[PDB]
Amino acid sequence: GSTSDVANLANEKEELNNKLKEAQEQLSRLKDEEISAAAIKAQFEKQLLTERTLKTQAVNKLAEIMNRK
Amino acid sequence: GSTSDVANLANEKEELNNKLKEAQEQLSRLKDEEISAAAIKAQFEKQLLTERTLKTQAVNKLAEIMNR
């Protein structure tokens, strides 16, 4: 009757709510990671610009010395 | 009264089913976004190695030339 129906539905709501909360905590940790990925990407883009620049400096100076006569 | 409460509880269960499904799908989306991002990490890492390597080869050949 209504009494065991209530008992069972209150239990399922508690179970689902708990699983939902766990899911939303995961999503939130992941959302914080996606923001911290944007900063790491920018850092990588910077390091790459820098490495490229240093590479061209070395390559060009080597070509220049090899071309010296 | 009690029978109304049961009807309302069933709807509230169903809505929680919906929210959890939505979250679990969102989690699958954010999951393969961690796969794409880590494949971008590895791509950046390869490019960085390549640039540093060409840099270091040029440096070392130039040093050898300058040192007679």
Residue B68: DSSP 8-state: -
Question: Which of B2, B8, B9, B14 to probe by mutation at the A interface, max A CB count within 10 Å?
Answer: B9
- Collapse the DSSP code of B57 into the 3-class scheme (helix H, G, I; strand E, B; otherwise coil) and give the result: helix
Whether A47 sits inside 8 A of B47 (CB atoms) is no
Look-up of token digits 């883009």: A45
Contacts 24+ apart (CB under 8 A), B17-26: B17/A16, B19/A16, B19/A20, B20/A16, B20/A19, B20/A20, B20/A23, B23/A20, B23/A23, B23/A24, B23/A27, B24/A23, B26/A23, B26/A27
**Shortest CA distance from A9: residue in chain B:** B9
Distance CA A41, CA B31 (A): 18
Whether B48 sits inside 8 A of A48 (CB atoms) is yes
CA distances from B62 to A45, B39, B48, B56, B59 (A): 27, 35, 21, 10, 5
Q: Among 1.10.1270.20, 1.20.1540.10, 1.10.10.10, 1.20.5.730, what is the CATH number of B1-68?
A: 1.20.5.730
- Collapse the DSSP code of B1 into the 3-class scheme (helix H, G, I; strand E, B; otherwise coil) and give the result: coil
Helix boundaries (H) for chain B: 2-66
Residue of A49, A47, A48, A64 whose CA lies nearest to B61? A64
Domain A1-69 CATH superfamily = Single helix bin (1.20.5.730)
Q: A interface toward B at CB cutoff 8 Å?
A: 2-3, 5-6, 9-10, 12-13, 16-17, 19-20, 23-24, 26-27, 30-31, 33-34, 37, 40-41, 44, 47-48, 51-52, 54-55, 58-59, 61-62, 65-66
Where along chain A do its domains lie? 1-69
CB B27 within 8 A of CB A27: yes
Residue of A61, A66, A52 whose CA lies nearest to B65? A66
Stated in angstroms to one decimal place, the resolution of this structure is 1.8
- Other C-beta atoms within 10 Å of B41: how many? 14
Number of helices (H) and strands (E) in chain A: give both, helices first. 1, 0
State the nearest Cα–Cα gap between A51 and chain B, in angstroms: 6
- Collapse the DSSP code of A1 into the 3-class scheme (helix H, G, I; strand E, B; otherwise coil) and give the result: coil
Distance CA B52, CA A67 (A): 23
